[PDB]
Paper text:
Liver-derived PCSK9 enhances the levels of circulating LDL-cholesterol (LDLc) by promoting the degradation of the LDL receptor (LDLR) within the acidic endosomal/lysosomal pathway. The crystal structures of PCSK9 revealed the existence of three distinct structural domains playing critical roles in the regulation of PCSK9 and its intracellular traffic: the prodomain (amino acids (aa), 31–152), the catalytic subunit (aa 152–421), and the C-terminal Cys/His-rich domain (CHRD; aa 453–692) that is composed of three repeat modules M1 (aa 453–529), M2 (aa 530–603), and M3 (aa 604–692). Structural and biochemical studies demonstrated that the catalytic domain of PCSK9 binds the epidermal growth factor-A (EGF-A) domain of the LDLR, and the PCSK9-LDLR complex is internalized into clathrin-coated vesicles. P1.40, a CHRD-specific single domain antibody (nanobody), prevents the ability of PCSK9 to enhance the degradation of the LDLR in cells and in transgenic mice that specifically express human PCSK9.
Numbering used by the authors:
A (entry chain A): 452 to 576, 583 to 664, 668 to 682
B (entry chain B): 1 to 127
The structure:
Amino acid sequence: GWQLFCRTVWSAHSGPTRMATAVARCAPDEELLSCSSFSRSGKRRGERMEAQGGKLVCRAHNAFGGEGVYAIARCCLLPQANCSVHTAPPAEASMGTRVHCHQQGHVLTGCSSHWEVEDLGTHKPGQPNQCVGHREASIHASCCHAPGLECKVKEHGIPAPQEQVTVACEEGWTLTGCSALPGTSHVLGAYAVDNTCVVRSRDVSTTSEGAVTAVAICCRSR
Amino acid sequence: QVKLEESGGGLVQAGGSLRLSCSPSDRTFSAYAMGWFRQVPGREREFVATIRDSDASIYYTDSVKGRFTISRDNAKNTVYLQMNSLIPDDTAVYYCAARQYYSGRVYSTFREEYDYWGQGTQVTVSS
Ligand SMILES: *[C@@H]1O[C@H](CO[C@@H]2O[C@@H](C)[C@@H](O)[C@@H](O)[C@@H]2O)[C@@H](O[C@@H]2O[C@H](CO)[C@@H](O)[C@H](O)[C@H]2NC(C)=O)[C@H](O)[C@H]1NC(C)=O
């Protein structure tokens, strides 16, 4: 019956090594509802929601040959909340890594993904409260217990990727999570701007043309 | 009825320093909290810094910690944003924000938490 307030926090650029990391953090009384990342060239290893000093933080990983990455936290005032992270490691021999909120009453607010390999491989091409990532990547689900909290998924896909793809939440909903659907080649990153989910792409033409899809997690109370 | 007036900004080179100032037209208006937000085009107005009445009330976004300093002068009724070792990523339109009344939160970090805003001052950090 309350209002859900969310804001975007960008970390400082990480630096150019494989071990160079970027951390985006929320204020002590805010909740980290999602974690995304951005790199001007691509050449990234995704991101993960990690526990640091009792609170959850958004950590971004750089790839070998990458100039650095930005960690992008979505920070929200969610009253009476209990948020946890559920991780599924990669299954390289599968059609994609899957994870969902295990506790009854748990609501999915965001999906993060990170990989250990230098870049993501090729393959032959969602459920309630479920995150789906690349077969070679670890998938991280942000799962929250909050009274009256309801979340829904909205998608927008364009064949010609260009500069960006956007998907916006409807009026009355708050954008809590922003990401790109997996298998979409040439993704620079994703980030929330108000109630709009922005997915940036490297504009590389088709080589079966594909569709770069912006995936939004929209939440409300009551 | 209160309009916040911003001073400073413009072009400055990487590694350089700049001081932004902000004061209301009516100097008898004392805000409980003063803040700085910045907007990169295509992105939301993001939180930079906040201050109330003490050093314990000061809070910065991680990306500006150790480089930027927020201070308040009651006698001049002005809030300052001293920006040192400026990096190309500091390029944005910087906005002053004022929250008139008390907040139960230790730090006011959301746009929605503020009432009055500055016009916005462009900061461009060369090469
Ligand atoms: C956040 O949740 C944990 C786990 O909650 C469980 O699942 C809920 C849906 C509900 O059924 C609860 O009653 C369950 O306890 C809270 O407590 C943890 O509980 C387990 C045992 O069930 C225990 O091993 C852990 O140590 C507990 N963790 C603690 C004490 O922090 C937890 O208290 C909740 N956090 C808040 C802030 O309320």
